[PDB]
Coordinates of all heavy atoms in Angstrom, one line a residue:
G1 N 0.7 -1.3 0.0 CA 0.0 0.1 0.0 C 0.8 1.3 0.0 O 0.2 2.5 -0.1
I2 N 2.1 1.2 0.1 CA 2.9 2.5 0.0 C 3.5 2.6 -1.4 O 4.1 1.7 -2.0 CB 4.2 2.4 1.0 CG1 3.6 2.4 2.4 CG2 5.0 3.7 0.7 CD1 4.6 2.0 3.3
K3 N 3.2 3.8 -2.0 CA 3.5 4.1 -3.3 C 4.9 4.6 -3.3 O 5.3 5.4 -2.4 CB 2.7 5.3 -4.0 CG 1.3 5.0 -4.3 CD 1.0 3.7 -4.9 CE -0.2 3.5 -5.6 NZ -0.3 4.1 -6.9
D4 N 5.8 4.0 -4.2 CA 7.2 4.5 -4.3 C 7.9 4.4 -2.9 O 8.5 5.5 -2.5 CB 7.3 6.0 -4.8 CG 6.6 6.1 -6.2 OD1 6.4 5.1 -6.9 OD2 6.3 7.3 -6.4
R5 N 7.8 3.2 -2.3 CA 8.7 3.0 -1.1 C 10.1 3.1 -1.7 O 10.4 2.5 -2.7 CB 8.4 1.7 -0.5 CG 9.3 1.4 0.7 CD 8.9 0.3 1.4 NE 9.8 -0.1 2.5 CZ 9.7 -1.1 3.4 NH1 8.7 -1.7 3.5 NH2 10.8 -1.1 4.2
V6 N 11.1 3.8 -1.0 CA 12.4 4.0 -1.4 C 13.4 3.2 -0.7 O 13.5 3.2 0.5 CB 12.6 5.5 -1.2 CG1 14.1 5.9 -1.4 CG2 11.7 6.5 -1.9
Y7 N 14.3 2.5 -1.4 CA 15.4 1.8 -1.0 C 16.6 2.6 -1.4 O 16.9 2.8 -2.6 CB 15.5 0.4 -1.6 CG 14.2 -0.4 -1.1 CD1 13.1 -0.5 -2.0 CD2 14.3 -1.0 0.1 CE1 11.9 -1.1 -1.5 CE2 13.1 -1.6 0.5 CZ 11.9 -1.7 -0.2 OH 10.8 -2.3 0.2
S8 N 17.4 3.0 -0.4 CA 18.6 3.9 -0.7 C 19.9 3.1 -0.1 O 19.7 2.4 0.9 CB 18.4 5.3 -0.1 OG 19.6 6.1 -0.5
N9 N 21.0 3.4 -0.7 CA 22.4 2.9 -0.3 C 23.4 3.8 -0.4 O 23.4 4.5 -1.4 CB 22.6 1.6 -0.9 CG 21.4 0.6 -0.9 OD1 20.6 0.6 -1.8 ND2 21.4 -0.2 0.2
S10 N 24.4 3.8 0.4 CA 25.4 4.8 0.6 C 26.7 4.2 0.2 O 27.0 3.0 0.4 CB 25.4 5.3 2.0 OG 24.3 6.2 2.3
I11 N 27.5 5.0 -0.4 CA 28.8 4.6 -1.0 C 29.9 5.2 -0.1 O 29.7 6.5 0.1 CB 29.1 5.1 -2.4 CG1 28.1 4.4 -3.3 CG2 30.5 4.8 -2.9 CD1 27.8 5.4 -4.5
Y12 N 30.8 4.5 0.5 CA 31.9 4.9 1.2 C 33.3 4.7 0.7 O 33.4 3.8 -0.2 CB 31.7 4.3 2.7 CG 30.5 4.7 3.5 CD1 29.3 4.2 3.2 CD2 30.6 5.8 4.6 CE1 28.2 4.5 4.0 CE2 29.5 6.0 5.2 CZ 28.3 5.4 4.9 OH 27.1 5.7 5.6
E13 N 34.2 5.6 1.0 CA 35.6 5.3 0.7 C 36.3 4.8 2.0 O 36.1 5.5 3.1 CB 36.3 6.6 0.1 CG 35.7 7.1 -1.2 CD 36.4 8.3 -1.8 OE1 36.6 9.4 -1.3 OE2 36.9 8.2 -3.0
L14 N 37.1 3.9 1.9 CA 38.0 3.3 3.0 C 39.3 3.9 2.8 O 40.0 3.8 1.8 CB 37.9 1.9 2.9 CG 36.4 1.3 2.9 CD1 36.3 0.0 2.4 CD2 35.9 1.4 4.4
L15 N 39.8 4.5 3.9 CA 41.1 5.1 3.8 C 42.0 4.3 4.7 O 41.6 3.6 5.6 CB 41.0 6.5 4.5 CG 40.1 7.6 3.8 CD1 40.2 9.0 4.5 CD2 40.4 7.8 2.4
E16 N 43.3 4.3 4.4 CA 44.4 3.6 5.2 C 45.6 4.4 5.0 O 46.0 4.8 4.0 CB 44.6 2.3 4.4 CG 45.7 1.4 5.1 CD 45.9 0.1 4.4 OE1 46.0 0.1 3.0 OE2 45.7 -1.0 5.0
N17 N 46.2 4.9 6.2 CA 47.3 5.9 6.3 C 47.1 7.0 5.3 O 48.1 7.3 4.6 CB 48.6 5.0 5.9 CG 48.9 4.2 7.1 OD1 49.4 4.6 8.1 ND2 48.8 2.8 6.9
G18 N 45.9 7.7 5.3 CA 45.7 8.8 4.4 C 45.4 8.6 2.9 O 45.2 9.6 2.3
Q19 N 45.5 7.4 2.4 CA 45.3 7.0 1.1 C 44.0 6.3 0.8 O 43.6 5.5 1.6 CB 46.4 5.9 0.5 CG 47.9 6.4 0.5 CD 48.0 7.5 -0.2 OE1 47.5 7.7 -1.4 NE2 48.6 8.7 0.4
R20 N 43.2 6.7 -0.3 CA 42.0 6.0 -0.7 C 42.4 4.6 -1.2 O 43.0 4.5 -2.1 CB 41.3 6.8 -1.8 CG 40.7 8.2 -1.3 CD 40.3 9.1 -2.4 NE 39.6 8.2 -3.6 CZ 40.1 8.0 -4.8 NH1 41.4 8.5 -5.2 NH2 39.3 7.3 -5.6
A21 N 42.0 3.6 -0.4 CA 42.3 2.1 -0.6 C 41.2 1.4 -1.2 O 41.4 0.3 -1.6 CB 42.8 1.6 0.7
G22 N 39.9 2.0 -1.1 CA 38.7 1.2 -1.6 C 37.5 2.1 -1.5 O 37.4 3.2 -0.9
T23 N 36.5 1.7 -2.4 CA 35.3 2.4 -2.4 C 34.3 1.4 -2.7 O 34.2 0.5 -3.5 CB 35.3 3.3 -3.7 OG1 36.3 4.3 -3.5 CG2 34.0 4.0 -3.8
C24 N 33.1 1.5 -1.8 CA 32.2 0.4 -1.7 C 30.8 0.9 -1.2 O 30.8 1.9 -0.5 CB 32.7 -0.9 -1.1 SG 32.9 -0.7 0.7
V25 N 29.8 0.0 -1.5 CA 28.6 0.3 -0.8 C 28.5 -0.6 0.4 O 28.6 -1.8 0.4 CB 27.4 0.3 -1.9 CG1 27.7 0.1 -3.3 CG2 26.3 -0.6 -1.5
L26 N 28.4 0.1 1.5 CA 28.5 -0.4 2.8 C 27.5 0.1 3.7 O 26.9 1.1 3.6 CB 29.9 0.3 3.3 CG 30.4 -0.3 4.5 CD1 30.6 -1.8 4.5 CD2 31.7 0.5 4.8
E27 N 26.9 -0.9 4.6 CA 26.0 -0.6 5.6 C 25.9 -1.6 6.6 O 26.3 -2.8 6.4 CB 24.6 -0.4 4.9 CG 24.0 -1.7 4.4 CD 22.9 -1.5 3.4 OE1 23.1 -0.6 2.5 OE2 21.8 -2.2 3.4
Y28 N 25.3 -1.3 7.8 CA 25.1 -2.3 8.8 C 23.8 -3.0 8.5 O 22.9 -2.5 7.9 CB 24.8 -1.7 10.2 CG 26.1 -1.1 10.9 CD1 26.3 0.2 10.7 CD2 26.9 -2.0 11.5 CE1 27.5 0.8 11.3 CE2 28.0 -1.4 12.1 CZ 28.4 -0.1 12.0 OH 29.5 0.4 12.5
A29 N 23.7 -4.2 9.0 CA 22.5 -5.0 9.0 C 21.6 -4.5 10.1 O 21.8 -4.7 11.3 CB 22.7 -6.5 9.2
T30 N 20.4 -3.9 9.7 CA 19.6 -3.1 10.7 C 18.9 -4.1 11.7 O 18.7 -3.6 12.8 CB 18.5 -2.2 9.9 OG1 19.0 -1.8 8.8 CG2 18.0 -1.1 10.9
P31 N 18.5 -5.3 11.3 CA 18.0 -6.2 12.4 C 18.9 -6.3 13.6 O 18.2 -6.5 14.6 CB 17.9 -7.4 11.6 CG 17.6 -7.1 10.3 CD 18.5 -5.9 10.0
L32 N 20.1 -6.1 13.6 CA 21.0 -6.3 14.8 C 20.7 -5.1 15.7 O 20.8 -5.3 17.0 CB 22.3 -6.2 14.5 CG 22.8 -7.5 13.6 CD1 24.2 -7.2 13.1 CD2 22.7 -8.8 14.5
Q33 N 20.4 -3.9 15.2 CA 20.0 -2.8 15.9 C 18.5 -3.1 16.5 O 18.3 -2.8 17.7 CB 19.9 -1.5 15.1 CG 20.1 -0.3 15.8 CD 19.9 0.9 14.8 OE1 19.0 0.9 14.0 NE2 20.8 1.9 14.9
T34 N 17.8 -3.8 15.8 CA 16.5 -4.2 16.2 C 16.6 -5.3 17.5 O 15.8 -5.2 18.4 CB 15.6 -4.6 15.1 OG1 15.5 -3.4 14.2 CG2 14.3 -4.9 15.5
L35 N 17.6 -6.2 17.4 CA 17.8 -7.1 18.6 C 18.4 -6.3 19.7 O 18.0 -6.5 20.9 CB 18.9 -8.2 18.3 CG 18.7 -9.3 17.3 CD1 19.8 -10.0 17.0 CD2 17.6 -10.2 18.0
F36 N 19.3 -5.3 19.5 CA 19.8 -4.4 20.6 C 18.7 -3.7 21.4 O 18.6 -3.8 22.6 CB 20.9 -3.4 20.1 CG 21.6 -2.7 21.2 CD1 22.9 -3.4 21.6 CD2 21.2 -1.8 22.0 CE1 23.6 -2.9 22.6 CE2 21.9 -1.2 23.0 CZ 23.2 -1.8 23.4
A37 N 17.8 -3.1 20.7 CA 16.6 -2.4 21.3 C 15.7 -3.3 22.0 O 15.4 -3.0 23.2 CB 15.9 -1.7 20.2
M38 N 15.4 -4.4 21.4 CA 14.5 -5.4 22.1 C 15.1 -5.8 23.5 O 14.3 -5.9 24.4 CB 14.4 -6.7 21.3 CG 13.4 -6.6 20.3 SD 13.1 -8.3 19.4 CE 11.9 -9.2 20.3
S39 N 16.4 -6.0 23.6 CA 16.9 -6.4 24.8 C 16.7 -5.3 26.0 O 16.9 -5.6 27.1 CB 18.4 -6.7 24.6 OG 19.2 -5.6 24.2

């Protein structure tokens, strides 16, 4: 019943000793935050 529910994802750069070493789409698994809260 929700029109245009939006799925978004964020791109991060991974740095190591001040050099860009990698670029990727990275996120936490949100259900684990949901276990944390439940507790």
Side-chain angles (χ1 to χ4, degrees):
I2 297 163
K3 289 316 193 85
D4 304 341
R5 182 172 171 172
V6 174
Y7 297 96
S8 191
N9 308 90
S10 285
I11 294 148
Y12 293 78
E13 294 188 306
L14 302 161
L15 299 182
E16 175 179 57
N17 287 289
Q19 290 310 308
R20 297 166 36 251
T23 296
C24 69
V25 358
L26 188 54
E27 70 202 42
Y28 287 99
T30 322
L32 294 172
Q33 206 185 43
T34 304
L35 291 164
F36 195 90
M38 277 185 85
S39 67

